[PDB]
Structures are given as C-alpha cells and as structure tokens.
Design a protein around this ligand. Structure first.
Ligand SMILES: *[C@@H]1O[C@H](CO)[C@@H](O)[C@H](O)[C@H]1NC(C)=O
Ligand SMILES: *[C@@H]1O[C@H](CO)[C@@H](O)[C@H](O)[C@H]1NC(C)=O
Lengths: 75, 109, 127, 493, 49
C-alpha cells in the first residue's frame, strides 16, 4: 500500500510545515504503544530474548525496544 | 489537429501576433514548429522554421515564439504584400506531420 | 539551383489510378528525403508520407496507409506518388517537398529546416 | 512595514566593501536590510510561478472491473485460452483450480484457469515536471516610509513587486524617493526542480520528489500518452480470489486517494487550480545598495506639536512601533525621534525606520525602533510640547544571545549549506564554514536518506552512547550524536 | 572561471543568430554577454564536482 511508503524525511522539507505535520507527527509511537497494550505476551517474549542474546545491558535494551519497534511494522 | 484562428486582420505598419495550438506530442514537446506562407495560386514558401531562429532570405519582421502548448507568430510593421495564407506545421511524436487549418491575413486599406 | 518540376494538371474518373511525377535537379538526389503534401482548394494542407532516396524505404500517414504508395527513381532523380481508387473528395492541389537526411543515409530525425523547397504543384480533378 | 507583524522576521546588519549584501528569502519569512547611511527595506518572497508544466507520469487511482470473463481447462493440457488476452487494457491472471468429472472434463487433477475483465480508470493522478528555466519568483519591495496604511498591509499596493526569472540575473527596481535598487538572486540553486515533480489531486496539489513518485505502486501511462487505456502493472489494484480451488474471481481494489493522502505525510502542499502557484522553498540573493537614496533629505525639521494616535506595540523581536500625527506647521518635515536614557546623556537605541518624514500633516506616520533591554524613553518632537514616552524591555543581552543562536542553529539546520549566505559579506571564515557545511551535509544526507525523526533520535542516542564508551574519536562521536539529535528533534518529518 | 569551446564567437550577419559553446566550472557560473549598457548576465549552475 502507498501508506506503507510515505514521502517523509528525505531532505525536501522547508520552512513551510508539511502536509501531516502536527497531528501526523505521531502515528507510529501511539500505534506501537497500542500494539504493546493489546499484545503483551509477545513483548515479554521479546524482553526475554533481549535478556538472552544481549551481553551488556545497553545491548539488551537496544534489542528489546527496537524489536518491539519492528513488531507492529509487519502487522 | 492544430487549432488556430481562421482569419486575422490588422492595420498596416502595426504589430500583430497569431498563435497555433496543438497538443503535447507535437507542439508542446518539440521544437519542430515551422510556418509557411501560401500565396494565392502559388506554391507554399517557408517564412519561419525553428521559431527561435529564422531562415535565410526572410526579413526579420517575422518572429516566432512558443509558450507551452501554443506557438505564436509575430509580425512587426504590417505591409500590403503580407496578405497571404499562413500555415503552421509540426512534426508530431509519432513520426508524421500535422498542419494547421490555414490562416488568411488581411491588411486594412 | 534546386529546381522542383511537377507534371501537368490531370482529370480522372473516380476509382481510377493517378501517378504524379516530381523531378528535382541541382543537387545530389540520393542524399535527400522526398515529401508529398496535398491541399484541397481553399483548405488546409495534408501530409501523406515521405520516401528516403538513400534506401527507398516507405512511410505514409495513418489515414493514407492502405491507399497511397510512393516510389523513387535514382536515375531520373524523381519520386512517383501513386494513388488508387480516387474519390470525389480527392480533388486537391498536390505539392512535393524536400528535406535533408542525416549523414548516415537515413531519415529518422528530420532536420530543422525541413520542407526547405517546394514544387509548383499538380492539380487533379475527380469527376 | 511589510515585515512588521510576522514572527519569522530576521535582521541583517551592515554592508560589504562593494555595498552588497547576500540574503536568502523564504515563503512566510522575511528579512529587513539597513546600513549606516542607507534606507531600510522590506523583503518578502510571496509568489513562485512556473510556466508550461510537463506531465511526467499519469497514475490511475480509481478503477472499475466489468465485462469479466473466464474459462477452465482440464488438467495436463496446458493453460486455458481466450481470444481476448491479446488486448492489454484488460487485466488477467493465471491461478490454479481443481477439475473433475463434475467439472466437465474426463480427467482428475488440478486444472488451469484464467480470468480477465475491463480495467477502466475513473479518477487518476497526474505528476507535472517543470524545468528550472520556466520558474518565476515574485518579490515585494517595501521601503520603511511609515505611511499609516502600510504596516502589514499585504493586500495594498504600497510596496513594489519585482519579477525575477533565471533568464535575467540582473533585475532592477526603481523606488520613488529611495533611488533605484539592484537585485541579484540565484533562482536555479534554490531548489533543484529536476528531482521534484508537481503531484496534482482533483483539487489539491503537492510538491514531491521525482524518485518517490516513480516508485508509486499505481497503474500508469506516460504523460505523453493520450489513449488513456494502457495501464501498466494493473495487478496492484485488482485481486484474484480463489477461495477453495474451484473458481477464480477478480475484484477491484478500493480508492487509495485517502491512502495517497496518508502517503503524502512528509510532502508540502501547493495548488495549481489557477496556475502553478507554489509557496514553498527559499531563494538565495545578493542585495546591491549602490543606488539607494534617502527620501526627503531636503525637508526641514518639524517644529510643531505631535500627538499619538496609536500606542506603542511590542513586536516578537524586541522592536517597537508607534503611530504619531504631526499637529504643527511646516509639512513636509522630519520627525524628531531619539532613544535616550533617563538623564538624556547617552543614546541607547537605534531607528529601524531611519529619519522619517511627514508626507502630509493629517496623515499619521509609523515609526519603528529597537530600544535596549530595560527602561527606555522615546522622545518625539521638541519643546514646547515635547513628547517623552517611557518604555520597558523584558529580557537580557545574554538571553538575546541565546535565542539568536537558537534561531541561527534552526535556520542553519533547515537551509543546509546555503544558510551561510544569510548575512555573508565575503569573509574567508564564511567560505570555510560553507565548505565544511557542504561536505558535512552531503555525508549527512547520504547517511540519513529517507529516515524518520524518531529513528533519527534513536541513531543519535546510539552514537552518543558509543562515543561515551570509547578521546578525540569519543568527542567527535558525541558531537555528531548531539547535533544529529538536535536535527532529528527540530525536523518536523 | 571558464573557457570557450567555441573560440572567438563572431557575428557574421546582424540578423543571423549565432550558437556559442562554453565549459563552466563546477558550482555557480555566470555568462557575460555584451558590454554595458544592456549587458546580459546568466545564472546557470553546474551539477557535479
Ligand atoms: C461489455 O459489456 C457491455 C454490456 O452492455 C457491452 O455493451 C460492451 O460492448 C462490452 N464490452 C466489450 C469490450 O466487450
Ligand atoms: C491598506 O491600504 C488601503 C489603501 O491605502 C486601505 O484602503 C486599507 O484599509 C489598508 N488596510 C490596512 C489593513 O491597513
């Protein structure tokens, strides 16, 4: 779908605000937060995986949060 | 086809502009814009090709310019002998040629 | 001097066949394409097609695909345009025009000064 | 008087040795130019028009499927055939179905199937591409005359409109009473339109990059095409349903014009209902003050009384404006105006509208000045009846520095390398900074092409963490991380 | 900043147009035509490095 390919953040923005500036600046954060609300078990599983593969705490956090960012992108 | 006014008249010694309009494939995309003068009972003769430039042996009174999909012909200092049939021709994208509907130039007495 | 000579006026019944001769002199005929343009009396010009004297290939307008055939003669430096199955609306003045082909002997992209010279015209009347 | 009233207004000071100043103009933003002994002007880019747009690509966006046909073939005799697939206006797909004796052939197994139907496009999208040669930039020129119907009177013919095109770099504008101004701009390098295409909806429009437009998964004809039927990759708007391997049916996918609207999140909207009007972008310019004159330098000093008809107002940049009417005799004459201290010892502020004159006694005048921080007093007129207006300015010089450097950082971020030309006078340091910005911005754009602000923040945080866990490399990493974090948080997309 | 590919541009005839070639440097480039008054200055930019 075209909504999956937005013409966003590729260096053409000027002083003028974009077409979906204000109300459109925050689809993804709220969408991911809602997905985490309604799909917790996957989030706990991802946290366990980050605990497992990660060696240091920073790597664990990076893997966990960024996996949770991956998760609703495909769905 | 090419759309242009059927008849254009003007006072002698004046400046008039006549326009030939086609489509994007022939006029608005190409520089193959040429104008031909048809004397009554005589063979056509080119007065202007490649509107940005002019032919040899033709007076500098005739000037041509293209604005988008419309090509314009401007004549400065109308005179009696300018009364003749003028045709706009364009080489279209498909490799063929298209001509205008023919224009009659009238000079007031 | 580039001189374009055309045949005289002809009259033919509808459905006949007419071949017109346009002879060009004063230049190298093989290195130039040849054009044929018609015009009804008091009407606009119509372009039939062109023949490249370098190779003899043919190209005609979409309207005149199945009725207009044009050939060329290198020896006489002339091109013959033949139209069959004449119609009452075919009565018009027919002009033969010339333009330059590229240095490769082909007529793919016409020059900027196309239709550089014109012939005197042939008048054909259909009964 | 044009800039007074807009938050996005910037001040440029001084001139070069050649009496020229490099400035950049923006839509919705403006800059005022003044010098030691020169009239103060108002500059605003209000219109950008392009001629003869060329249709690069026509995208279909509404479709309907009719005249649907299908036929099957028994297993192991190839694929089913119609006399019909020869025409490309239809959409066809080969799926796989079950066949049997109940299905009309004497062999058992999986059989072939194919369906085709009309693909007629109801509504469509057109993308217009325009050469930089066809661009036109319209700029309004407003000297600080101070007439009563000038402050923010954008709809009034008070300033002078100038038309500049790439065909003539030199555009020359005469100002009545202020000499004649030489205007130099760089329309070609403002935005490289070779990579942008004008996308047009039924009544709305956007300015989008050409490449992303070429990557849209919608049916298309080339712009030069006029048949209106050869729709390429039609399968993106049709679905062939094969529920249980017995029948393939084709249906039309819906309307993506709302989906397209969502896909234009990071695009900038324009309109071309009555011409390719664009209110987006920036224009780098060089201002030459060679032939600028001061109006009314032969008019004597005002001697009569003055009265205030509109009170002092405080702008967004610490400047003040006042409307005062001359009640005495001797018009035309110069308005007395000083920004003095409480003891009237040292001049504190400076005039924005230099040495104004009274065109007519009844007509009031508008005066702009920049008072210093704290207490300030405006002296208009002379004894008898000398007006002394008290004013207070909030803030501090350190503050003024912090928001001016924040604004400089923001304009640098949103312009790129060209921001170094905002007030450049030809200094070698300016050129060095410009070169460094070009190289750094090229690397930055190569590294952050097509990435959102949130993930920009994520990458910046990662870079700062890496820098904090490594000396020169560490400080370089934390610096690049913090600057990219600022860029990500500041960018709206 | 640049050099003329068509060395010595000449006006053979007053009303005859003449084609001129030049090789501008990378970046901002300015074409100077004629002399004051009425001198033409163009504003082409070269894309590359
Ligand atoms: C589609 O069906 C309609 C039924 O009314 C018919 O008129 C039309 O000719 C058909 N189109 C084709 C291409 O067969
Ligand atoms: C702008 O100027 C015109 C003419 O001077 C005047 O009629 C109009 O009221 C002014 N508008 C404003 C907002 O000052």
């Amino acid at each position: 779908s075209v909504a999956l390919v937005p013409h966003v953040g590729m260096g053409l923005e000027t002083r003028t605000e974009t077409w979906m500036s204000s109300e459109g600046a925050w689809k993804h954060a709220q969408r991911i937060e809602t997905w985490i609300l309604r799909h917790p078990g996957f989030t706990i599983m991802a946290a366990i995986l980050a605990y497992t593969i990660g060696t240091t705490h920073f790597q664990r956090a990076l893997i966990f949060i960024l996996l949770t960012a991956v998760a609703p992108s495909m769905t | 086809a090419l759309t242009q006014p059927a008849s254009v008249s003007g006072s002698p010694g004046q400046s008039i502009t006549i326009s030939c309009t086609g489509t994007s494939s022939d006029v608005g995309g190409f520089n193959y814009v040429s104008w031909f003068q048809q004397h009554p009972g005589k063979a056509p003769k080119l007065m202007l090709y490649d509107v940005t430039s002019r032919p040899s042996g033709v007076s500098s009174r005739f000037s041509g310019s293209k604005s988008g999909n419309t090509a314009s012909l401007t004549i400065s200092g109308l005179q009696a002998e300018d009364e003749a049939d003028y045709y706009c021709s364009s080489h279209t994208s498909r490799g063929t040629w298209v001509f205008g509907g023919g224009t009659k130039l009238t000079v007031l007495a | 001097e580039v001189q374009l000579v055309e045949s005289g006026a002809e009259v033919k019944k509808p459905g006949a066949s007419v071949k017109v001769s346009c002879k060009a002199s004063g230049y190298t005929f093989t290195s130039y394409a040849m054009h044929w343009v018609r015009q009804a009396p008091g009407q606009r010009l119509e372009w039939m097609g062109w023949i490249n004297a370098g190779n003899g290939n043919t190209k005609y307008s979409q309207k005149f695909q199945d009725r207009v055939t044009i050939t060329r003669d290198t020896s006489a430096s002339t091109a013959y345009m033949e139209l069959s199955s004449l119609r009452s609306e075919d009565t018009a003045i027919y002009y033969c025009a010339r333009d330059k082909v590229d240095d490769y002997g082909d007529y793919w992209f016409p020059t900027l000064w196309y239709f550089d010279y014109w012939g005197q015209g042939t008048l054909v009347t259909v009964s | 008087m044009r800039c007074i009233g807009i938050s996005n207004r910037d001040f440029v000071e001084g001139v070069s040795g050649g009496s020229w100043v490099d400035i950049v103009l923006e839509h919705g933003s403006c800059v005022t130019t003044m010098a030691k002994n020169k009239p103060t002007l108002d500059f605003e880019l209000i219109k950008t028009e392009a001629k003869q747009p060329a249709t690069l690509r026509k995208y279909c966006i509404e479709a309907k499927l009719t005249n649907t046909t299908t036929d099957s073939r028994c297993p192991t005799q190839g694929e089913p055939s119609l006399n019909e697939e020869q025409d490309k206006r239809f959409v066809c797909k080969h799926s796989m179905v079950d066949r049997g004796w109940g299905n009309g052939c004497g062999l058992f197994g999986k059989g072939g199937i194919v369906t085709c139907a009309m693909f007629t496009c109801k509504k469509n999208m057109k993308g217009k591409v325009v050469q930089p040669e066809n661009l036109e930039y319209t700029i309004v020129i407003t000297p600080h005359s101070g007439e009563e119907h000038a402050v923010g009177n954008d709809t009034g013919k008070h300033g002078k409109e100038i038309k500049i095109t790439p065909q003539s770099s030199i555009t020359e504008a005469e100002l009545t009473g202020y000499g004649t101004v030489t205007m130099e701009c760089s329309p070609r390098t403002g935005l490289d339109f070779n990579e942008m295409v004008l996308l047009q909806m039924e009544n709305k429009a956007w300015l989008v990059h050409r490449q992303w437009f070429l990557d849209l998964p919608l049916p298309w004809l080339p712009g030069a095409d006029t048949q209106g039927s050869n729709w390429i990759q039609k399968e993106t708007l049709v679905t062939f349903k094969n529920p249980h391997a017995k029948k393939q049916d084709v249906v039309v996918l819906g309307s993506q014009e709302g989906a397209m609207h969502t896909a234009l999140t990071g695009a900038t909207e324009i309109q071309m209902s009555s011409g390719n009007l664009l209110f987006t972008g920036h224009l780098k310019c060089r201002l030459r003050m060679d032939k600028l004159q001061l109006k009314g330098m032969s008019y004597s000093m005002c001697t009569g009384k003055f009265k205030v008809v509109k009170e002092i107002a405080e702008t967004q940049h610490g400047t003040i404006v006042i409307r005062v009417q001359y009640e005495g005799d001797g018009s035309p004459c110069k308005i007395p105006f000083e920004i003095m201290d409480l003891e009237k010892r040292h001049v504190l502020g400076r005039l924005i509208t230099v040495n104004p004159i009274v065109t007519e006694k009844d007509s009031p005048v508008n005066i702009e000045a920049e008072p210093p921080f704290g207490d300030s007093y405006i002296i208009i007129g002379v004894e008898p009846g000398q007006l002394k207006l008290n004013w207070f300015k909030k803030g501090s010089s350190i503050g003024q520095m912090i928001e001016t450097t924040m604004r400089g950082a923001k304009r640098m971020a949103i312009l790129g390398d060209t921001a170094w030309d905002f007030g450049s006078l030809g200094g070698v340091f300016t050129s060095i900074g410009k070169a460094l910005h070009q190289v750094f911005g090229a690397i930055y754009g190569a590294a952050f092409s097509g990435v959102s602000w949130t993930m920009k923040i994520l990458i910046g945080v990662i870079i700062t963490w890496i820098g904090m866990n490594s000396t020169s490399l560490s400080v370089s990493l934390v610096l690049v991380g913090v600057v990219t974090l600022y860029l990500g948080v500041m960018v709206q997309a």
